[PDB]
Write a protein that binds this ligand. Structure first.
Ligand SMILES: CC(=O)Nc1ccc(-c2cn[nH]c2)c2cccnc12
Length: 112
C-alpha cells in the first residue's frame, strides 16, 4: 500500500464522520475549563480536530489506529456522561452512523 492514497482516504473518511456529528459535539477537545473534572475520569481525551492533526502528523498508518481514536471519542463520551443526556445519546448515534462510514472506508483501504 502507498501512503498518499491511504491518507486521502482517511481525510475523506474523517470528513464523513464529522458530518454525522451535526451538533459539533466532537469537533474540538472537551473544554477542560468548563469541565474541570474531565481528566479525572478520562485517561485519553480525543476529538476530530486532534484526529486531523494526528492524521497529518502521519500518526495513522493503518485503519485500526484511525478507528481506535474514533472509538475513543465515542467511549469517552459514553463514560463521562449520564445515559439521560444529549451528550450520551450523541455518542450512541455517532457510534451507529460512524460505524457504517468506517466499514465502507476500511473496505476501500483493503482494496489498496
Ligand atoms: C464531548 C463531551 O463529553 N462534552 C461535554 C460533556 C459535558 C459537559 C458538561 C456538562 N456539564 N458541564 C459540562 C460539556 C460542557 C461543554 C462542552 N462539552 C461538554
Amino acid at each position: 500500500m502507498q501512503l498518499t492514497p491511504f491518507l486521502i482516504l482517511l481525510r475523506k473518511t474523517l470528513e464523513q464522520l464529522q458530518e454525522k456529528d451535526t451538533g459539533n459535539i466532537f469537533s474540538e477537545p472537551v473544554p477542560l475549563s468548563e469541565v474541570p473534572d474531565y481528566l479525572d475520569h478520562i485517561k485519553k481525551p480525543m476529538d476530530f480536530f486532534t484526529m486531523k492533526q494526528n492524521l497529518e502528523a502521519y500518526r495513522y498508518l493503518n485503519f485500526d489506529d484511525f478507528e481506535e481514536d474514533f472509538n475513543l471519542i465515542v467511549s469517552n463520551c459514553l463514560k463521562y456522561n449520564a445515559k439521560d443526556t444529549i451528550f450520551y445519546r450523541a455518542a450512541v448515534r455517532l457510534r451507529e452512523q460512524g460505524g457504517a462510514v468506517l466499514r465502507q472506508a476500511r473496505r476501500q483501504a483493503e482494496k489498496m
